[PDB]
Design a protein around this ligand. Structure first.
Ligand SMILES: NC(=O)c1ccc[n+]([C@@H]2O[C@H](COP(=O)([O-])OP(=O)(O)OC[C@H]3O[C@@H](n4cnc5c(N)ncnc54)[C@H](O)[C@@H]3O)[C@@H](O)[C@H]2O)c1
Ligand SMILES: NC(=O)c1ccc[n+]([C@@H]2O[C@H](COP(=O)([O-])OP(=O)(O)OC[C@H]3O[C@@H](n4cnc5c(N)ncnc54)[C@H](O)[C@@H]3O)[C@@H](O)[C@H]2O)c1
Ligand SMILES: Nc1ncnc2c1ncn2[C@@H]1O[C@@H]2COP(=O)(O)OP(=O)(O)OC[C@H]3O[C@@H](O[C@H]2[C@H]1O)[C@H](O)[C@@H]3O
Ligand SMILES: Nc1ncnc2c1ncn2[C@@H]1O[C@@H]2COP(=O)(O)OP(=O)(O)OC[C@H]3O[C@@H](O[C@H]2[C@H]1O)[C@H](O)[C@@H]3O
Lengths: 473, 473
């Protein structure tokens, strides 16, 4: 289904930002607390007991750690050992980290010591450049896909982690290049603050400096904060007081032009990220098909149909990936060229002709999987081919359909074209929840109109375009 | 009586600092809360109610004011009006302000908007230079006796007062010269933080910068903080938790080399300041007397006695103010010169010969009051004068005694010298609590030994010196 209109507007804006590679993610400690790591308060629980305090009655953990260091003549051995033992455990990644790794985001700023972001980026075969030291800023990893600025330290270097109040006090001098880099990113990139509480003194100082430098012309940043929920045993008045205090905090965040999105549940973050990826993943379509006969239409009429379909797809800011199949590939190229020339960007039209010969047939399967992996939505037209002097049904269209379905791609079999596409349409229609879960009345009507053979070229193309649009957004 | 040894050590050290004019006072809002001004929380009580919050449940009043400004599109009209109406009231000064005005302190740093310090300084006929604007730093008032840096703003300029979080955020840029001046004073002068909570973000930033610049070689500063007392309805465990938290806070203060003195009561501040002034006020003695006969001793023996008494007084770092009386003034001068030459500082020996003639007798009274006002302790020797060919009792010694007593000066009538000094000794002895309240056994023994005419010169001088010492400290 869908979400609140505010969340939908945020999704549209951030998908617009990400596709231009001008988006950054600021991940706090809260993004990793769902993985399985104990909260920092629970880590400091024995430490507070040692100096005679209690974490449950303490609001400032930084001052708690500073008191612990003061008792031990400024020694951090126990704190370093605690953070090293806790944040270096072997835990499975959450879905949020994998989604963020799949997104085309080239900048991560983290206040968490764990390497979950690095691991998520490396699992997706993305070269990630982690920077948590001043000297590391002067060197850039070659062909990096994303840079993770760990602005508070790494788990493998506990002595450098910003935990106590002296660390924050000397941060402005020791880690000044990181402050300058974050100040530059907060004005040159659009941030999405996920799992961040906005209570960090370093972030307060940096944001205040940015606001003082730019006043009302600050760049718009987005934030995700869960609304306060009533505790199991609490009066109504205190819950309303907490909600009022959270509303004031959210309004105060927008002083720095950080728009806050209220989230009912923590699991809504994953649903937002999935939507953001889907609006990007489905932006590329895969025009599958091959035809020597064109069913009810004549060859010229169907060629015009395919040409205009590709022209409309390109006109609606879609990316066409075509295998240059016999009978549809040339007309797809013609439509794309007619729309574009009214040079060719490598992102708009992607041609992958299949090598002809017994040597290329062995690599055909991986070639086709590589093609389909580039796309998010698959559209199937006709699907017959000439074999043994007869118009047989082309099994490559079926193979593409199977590969796209294995990849959880949205399949749109145009049944009006006929042949193997009609069979695909019937197969999808028999079990509609399997291929299109949670569909609406409009989606079902459009799908049932895909097999309406009495439609003209324009009506069928409009049906397909509306179907792809409601799929993408 | 006396106080704890820690407080006594602080008193000695700070009196040593003040007498060298290297001491400064940092007065927070708490020093004025005893005057009659309502607390800042009570001022913000209607403001919190307006935006739906409550001050009693809020710990950060700065964020409360910032929320109030955020609700009103960043307008501070109500807050400015509130602070102007509250901190500009006509209230009587406390004793602490008057004592601080009487002390030889040339630098005051204040986070309070009220003009109580200025008023206290002006009541003592001291030229005070109040600075709360950046431009005001470039101009110094001629012959100023003390400069009051109001580092948060003045009551008469409510719009410039640092009240909300935006003010603190932009303080580092707008009021940077004040930050630099306070950083210089925190390393060139010894501070006494009275009525300050050490929760101000500006002070935290400045102290952290000073510590980062100087590390373990920071100058020693002193602080006065009241120990936590149990509330009327509170469990023992929570009170012990509060005490532990206060002890940790006090220890954390010493990270910046700020030694904290624990005070049982708020009224102990006045008792500490009175002690600090008394150790400075009593450092100057007034050798009163006049002699044509020298009682039991011969003229030469008594001249040697007075000479050695003055020599011992100067040797013990006392300041002698003498009216150049007939019979003691010359020998006081001889003793002071013999001690000093073994130039003359204007503070060690102060000579005020009385103008002889009917024109000077009319101003004699104000001259004598001016002399005695310069001193803290009065010592009386002999007191006879030749009149009508006979050795009459000199009424000027009695007049000096009366003037010193009117000024609450400690009177030490040396009864062994005799004449009007014996009468003075008897008068003080008859009602001893009137002149020496709260005396000890040692003080009474020394006073009773002042009239022991069988004492030699050395024994009598040692008695007087010990008496003056136990008076001063
Ligand atoms: O300081 P800091 O912000 O770096 O650390 P933190 O622990 O204070 O982070 C708290 C923030 O993270 C979010 N958060 C907490 N637990 C979470 C979870 N399990 N899943 C997703 N988000 C969560 C909260 O919304 C909150 O805003
Ligand atoms: O912040 P800020 O420190 O500027 O303001 P504040 O009101 O927070 O000042 C509190 C400090 O002032 C002292 N104080 C409070 N009331 C007092 C009184 N009546 N007399 C003397 N001292 C008092 C307390 O010891 C405390 O350390
Ligand atoms: N002389 C040729 N010149 C160029 N191209 C040729 C020739 N001869 C055949 N082709 C094309 O090769 C692909 C592999 O051949 P195929 O296995 O027979 O394909 P198919 O079963 O028709 O599947 C159809 C899908 O495959 C791809 O195009 C097919 C053929 O159209 C597309 O992605 C389709 O969407
Ligand atoms: N030719 C003189 N040449 C110089 N000095 C003289 C002369 N003649 C008198 N004096 C002094 O004038 C002061 C006023 O005179 P007085 O009123 O008679 O004084 P006093 O009654 O003896 O009081 C004693 C106290 O006054 C002051 O010294 C006295 C006299 O000693 C001191 O402070 C004493 O401690």
């Amino acid at each position: 289904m869908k979400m609140n209109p505010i969340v939908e507007l945020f999704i549209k804006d951030f998908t617009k930002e990400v596709m231009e590679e001008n988006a950054a993610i600021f991940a706090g400690a809260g993004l990793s607390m769902s993985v399985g790591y104990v909260s920092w308060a629970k880590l400091l629980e024995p430490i507070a007991q040692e100096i005679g305090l209690d974490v449950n009655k303490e609001n400032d953990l930084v001052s708690l750690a500073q008191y612990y260091c003061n008792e031990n003549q400024g020694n951090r051995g126990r704190i370093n050992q605690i953070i090293l033992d806790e944040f270096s455990r072997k835990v499975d990644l959450t879905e949020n980290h994998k989604i963020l790794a799949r997104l085309p985001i080239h900048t991560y700023w983290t206040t968490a010591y764990d390497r979950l972001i690095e691991k998520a980026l490396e699992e997706e075969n993305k070269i990630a450049d982690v920077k948590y030291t001043v000297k590391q800023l002067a060197t850039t990893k070659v062909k990096r896909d994303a840079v993770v600025y760990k602005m508070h330290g790494d788990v493998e270097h506990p002595s450098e982690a910003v935990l106590i109040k002296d660390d924050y006090e000397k941060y402005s001098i020791k880690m000044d290049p990181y402050i300058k880099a974050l100040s530059g990113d907060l004005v040159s990139k659009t941030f999405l603050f996920v799992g961040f509480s906005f209570t960090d003194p370093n972030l307060d100082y940096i944001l205040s400096r940015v606001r003082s430098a730019y006043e009302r012309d600050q760049r718009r940043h987005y934030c995700l904060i869960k609304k306060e929920e009533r505790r199991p045993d609490e009066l109504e008045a205190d819950f309303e007081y907490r909600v009022r205090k959270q509303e004031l905090f959210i309004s105060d965040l927008s002083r720095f032009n950080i728009k806050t999105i209220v989230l009912n549940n923590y699991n809504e973050i994953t649903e937002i990220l999935q939507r953001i990826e889907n609006n990007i993943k489905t932006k590329t379509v895969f025009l599958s098909g091959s035809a020597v006969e064109y069913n009810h239409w004549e060859t010229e009429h169907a060629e015009q149909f395919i040409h205009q379909l590709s022209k409309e797809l390109i006109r609606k800011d879609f990316n066409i990936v075509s295998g240059f199949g016999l009978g549809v590939g040339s007309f797809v190229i013609n439509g794309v060229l007619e729309e574009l020339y009214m040079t060719i960007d490598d992102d708009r039209l992607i041609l992958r002709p299949f090598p002809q010969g017994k040597k290329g047939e062995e690599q055909w399967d991986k070639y086709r999987r590589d093609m389909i992996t580039r796309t998010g939505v698959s559209i199937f037209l006709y699907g017959n081919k000439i074999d043994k002097g007869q118009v047989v049904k082309a099994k490559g269209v079926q193979s593409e359909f199977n590969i796209s379905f294995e990849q959880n791609n949205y399949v749109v079999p145009v049944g009006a074209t006929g042949y193997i596409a009609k069979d695909l349409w019937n197969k999808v229609n028999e079990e509609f929840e399997t291929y299109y879960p949670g569909a609406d009345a409009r989606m079902k009507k459009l799908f049932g109109e895909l097999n309406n053979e009495a439609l003209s070229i324009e009506e069928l193309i409009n049906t397909i375009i509306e179907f792809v649009e409601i799929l993408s957004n």
